[PDB]
Amino acid sequence: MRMSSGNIGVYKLDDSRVDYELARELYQNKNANYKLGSSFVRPIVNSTTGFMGVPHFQIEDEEAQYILDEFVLDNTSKMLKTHTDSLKQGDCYIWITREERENPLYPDKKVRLIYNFISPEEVKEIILDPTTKEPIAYILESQNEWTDLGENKRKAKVKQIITAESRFVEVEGDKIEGLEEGETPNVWGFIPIIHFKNEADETLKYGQSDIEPIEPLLKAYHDVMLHALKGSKMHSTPKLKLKLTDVASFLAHNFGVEDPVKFAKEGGKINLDGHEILFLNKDEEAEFVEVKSAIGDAKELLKLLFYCIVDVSETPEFIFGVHTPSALASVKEQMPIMVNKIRRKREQFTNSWQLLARMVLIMSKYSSYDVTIGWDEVNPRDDKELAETLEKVCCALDKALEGGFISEESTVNFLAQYIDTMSNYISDDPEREGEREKIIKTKML
Amino acid sequence: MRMSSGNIGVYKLDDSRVDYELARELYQNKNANYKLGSSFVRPIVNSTTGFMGVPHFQIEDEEAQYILDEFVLDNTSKMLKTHTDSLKQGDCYIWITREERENPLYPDKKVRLIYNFISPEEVKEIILDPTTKEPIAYILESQNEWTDLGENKRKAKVKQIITAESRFVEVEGDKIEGLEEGETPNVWGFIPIIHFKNEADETLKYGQSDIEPIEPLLKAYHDVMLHALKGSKMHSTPKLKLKLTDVASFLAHNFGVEDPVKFAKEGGKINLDGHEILFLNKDEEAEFVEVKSAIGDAKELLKLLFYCIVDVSETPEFIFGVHTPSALASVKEQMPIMVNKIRRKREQFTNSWQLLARMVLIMSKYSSYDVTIGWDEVNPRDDKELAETLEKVCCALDKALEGGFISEESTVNFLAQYIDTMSNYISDDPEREGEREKIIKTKML
Amino acid sequence: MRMSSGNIGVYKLDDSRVDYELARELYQNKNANYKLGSSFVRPIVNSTTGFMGVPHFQIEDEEAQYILDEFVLDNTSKMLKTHTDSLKQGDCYIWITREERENPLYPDKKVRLIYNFISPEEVKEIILDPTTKEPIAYILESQNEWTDLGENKRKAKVKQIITAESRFVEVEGDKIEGLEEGETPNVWGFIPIIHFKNEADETLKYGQSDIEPIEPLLKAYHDVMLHALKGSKMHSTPKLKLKLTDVASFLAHNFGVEDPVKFAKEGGKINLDGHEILFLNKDEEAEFVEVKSAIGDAKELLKLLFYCIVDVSETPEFIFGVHTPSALASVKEQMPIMVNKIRRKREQFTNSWQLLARMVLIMSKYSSYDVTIGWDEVNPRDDKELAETLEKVCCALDKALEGGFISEESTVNFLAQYIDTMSNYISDDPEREGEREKIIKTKML
């Protein structure tokens, strides 16, 4: 809708948050006000996060590439879980910490970088530079209830400030052995936390969940389904109606109910086997009071709400093929829509992955720190087709000999692409198999 | 749903558990409150477990690879059962123990590593390091009722603390020969227990079952089915209605029921053959009191609940194609959805398998310990197609001769992939056939 | 459902059993309370058993391989029967015994190993080591009623205690000709009994049948079908209704029933031919009292219960193609689901088969005892396709000559696989044809 040039309020950044507990309950189908309606949350979020896969850190420096190779080999699962958490809860925070912890379970790796998650409820507040809107302090706070290895219950409320200059931690309650209260300087001059933000908007300080667009539709679906279920429970089973000359004597004789008022008060149930035969007087009548449909048009409304949910989430129909069996027959025909959705979705996180890879490289001399992110194939290419186009390129070259060296450049680049695309396995996240094969090849030769 | 920046409680870790008894009863279809509804639990969990297969331990060191080869050859079945238990009960605990005991059933194996399951109810409490959340003690407790090899019944309530420094065990009852009470030092400086955690969440101490998202839907499905069955039992069979001048005389003459009150009180049943003929005087009337539908709209509600269950579990429709025969015609078309789901599910456990392999290597010098996890083919590739693309690669090479030395690297890597993918059998979990073929080839040559 | 960290009872091993008599009656369709419903037990169990086939014992030691070859040649039928018994009854026990008894029917075999079945009801109790939960004594007991070769009936209650050190047997009643009472030491220091356990669970001492998940659904199906049959018998045939001026006079004149009360009491039947014609007064009326449907919605309920049974058992729909004719058109499209089910199921028994083969080798020096279990093809590969990929591999090699010496290692392994896969016949369980072809080839040359 339009408005005049004037008559508009002053811009202000919105610092509202996603209510992460409700988002997790909806995802896990736990919230009693959405139980029948929140069935759609899991397929949407999980299909979106599974098809988008995990990033592929590409950097021209070989040492930086080795560092990122080791990092992805250690943390591909957590990298996928980051996408899942960002899509579900709106915000996900990743804390990179370097530990020199010696323990006999890790004799190979003396020093490690840990891919720690900060739960979005731990982040009490984010202090932003007003100009650049980049963080200058993270306020983390949590309640730690833990039993000691003896018999003592322990409780400790720990809060901490993480800033570029230093990090400060203070705790009230039982002492934590692994924490040192007070300020401690930051080994690097940047905050080691990466803020992954789903559906990042310039006007919002925090991200938005994929559940938020569908949440009113989920509530409406739950309401319609619950009303339908209650109505069917009340009215689907027909009610036998007996118009009798004397009700009380009929009850006393047939069912032994000498006191029908007391019987109704105590919740007594008349027992029936289903094979009864009715003997009645001339005047007495028996009929079934029955509904044509206890649900009526609720099914159409649920269908319309399902259509609205599918529209909002932009999920391809094969993800919900049980509702629409047509989609199940042409999934490869549906794949362009999924590819478009994943193309749009991957750009939200790729800058955060650039930041994460840059921080990992800095935390461990290199000639470059900018990292380009590849991704898993949403619509995988057959190896046979790739080899076919390779053969076509090769036979097309070695002819029209005035081409020059660009033929060599094109074919060597194509082989570089081909090896990477062939080695990466379709049904496995990340390129860990590529690194494994390369390392085994280098060692065994 | 949105909320203000403030007005949020302090973060606290959730230590709730999955109620493993109910999960097993629902899986086995035993719980009386879910019998008609819990039919869906088995296909979901078992399809997800069968299609995700078992891990393939890959490590560059040949001795470590041999150790892991022997381990998988021994314990592939238990590795699959680990996935089944994690998906069903939410939590599964694997205890690795080294046994030097000699018995004549195993003369080949002087020393063995045992893949022991700790039932999730045995784990009374897990003591976590508050900072890293690394487990520092496991509180195992169980009630051991066992018959003696003689005639005596025996009973003992065994509890034990498993810690990195040592393990402490105490018993309350009939003393057990195989257990030594008191502290005994731990040969390795880590707790040799792997906590497999289905649907691991940062905010939860324990895992989540795949039954939890569908559980309210299973309960609703059971309620609808049971109400439908009871209504059909009571009302599906039409009730013959006789409007008579004198009911008691009719009963006394036709059926010999000269005391209808006593007859109804004692539960007497009038006997009919089905070929009756009704002779009535002019005033009397006979009619069937009949329902148009004793079930009404319960079938539509069950269809909707089935759709919701399929959505929540994200099961591909061909798993439940008896409901929807359309899916059964295009299973290969629907396989990519299963591939996506199995990718996402496999990423949950792979870190635990890396930990397990690392512990196994440590519990039995090696230049590397970072094991990498391969997996079974969700949608297998045909061997002929792999050979065709290999032929295409081979013919593409040896032409455009400025490609360089990387052609040999690419082709030898493809051969290494090809032999591995061919030797592994589709219809058999794990790569045990690969190891056995390699060993037989090495011995017989 | 969720629960608190506390508020849970102590873990205890469940020693309940499967009620094997009821399981066999359900399989054989004998139990009176399941006759109409237990039709589904046979196709489920028998399809699962037939498709899973029998193990293939593979060991690199040629002498051990020969021993296992002879064993499977003798006992493949009993190996399949073991799977059938385990799936049906939950438990199945195999007792390996070595017999030196000479008889003229076996002049070729001085010494034999017998594959005996212990019926699961014979096993009165299993004494388990409390720590390892391995058996240390089997309590077998049975009532032996047998006729003497003369005219005498004989009865004897024989119980025995099979332990690792010795087996003790004591018998009441008539003297058994072939049994010696009292203790006798074991020639080997292990109990030669293999406990095959279908759906083995860590919390259950004994196995559990595939009938247990479906049993309540079978009962519900039987109840619905029986109620439908009784209702149809009572009410399907319409009841002719005559509204007469004088009923008794009509009966006496037409059907000669001078005493209708005595006629009804004695169960007399009025005889009709079907071609009657009714002559009536003005006031008299005749009408058919008829039901619109004596079954009502029981057909929908039986369909829903059939769907639930198919879901629980996870059987592919082509096993029940008579219900769903769609499945009959695309069995080869359905076969991946069967392959998945059999993949999951085979892991339950493969460890037991490894134990059995280990015992057989020990009960008859060898350099290895670990046996790898192959299996029949659930979805067989065409020989022509295998040969096609063979020639593709062969032509792919011998080119790009820098591949090295691993080409021979790959192709010899491929030929070893090809010979085994070709010789094994699809429509015959086990590899007995393979062993016999090998033996005939070696003998005739």
Residue numbers in the entry:
A (entry chain C), B (entry chain D), C (entry chain E): 19 to 382, 389 to 469
Show sentences the authors wrote:
Here, we reveal the extended and contracted atomic structures of an intact contractile-tailed phage (φCD508) that binds to and penetrates the protective S-layer of the Gram-positive human pathogen Clostridioides difficile. The virion can be divided into five distinct regions: the head, neck, tail, baseplate, and needle. Structures of purified φCD508 virions in both extended and contracted conformations were determined by single-particle EM of frozen-hydrated samples; the resolution ranged from 2.6 to 4.0 Å for the extended phage, and 2.9 to 4.2 Å for the contracted form.
At the base of the capsid sits a unique opening, centered on what would be a fivefold symmetry axis in a complete icosahedron; it is made up of 12 copies of portal protein gp45, forming an opening through which DNA is ejected from the capsid. Thus, there is a 5–12-fold symmetry mismatch between the capsid and the portal.
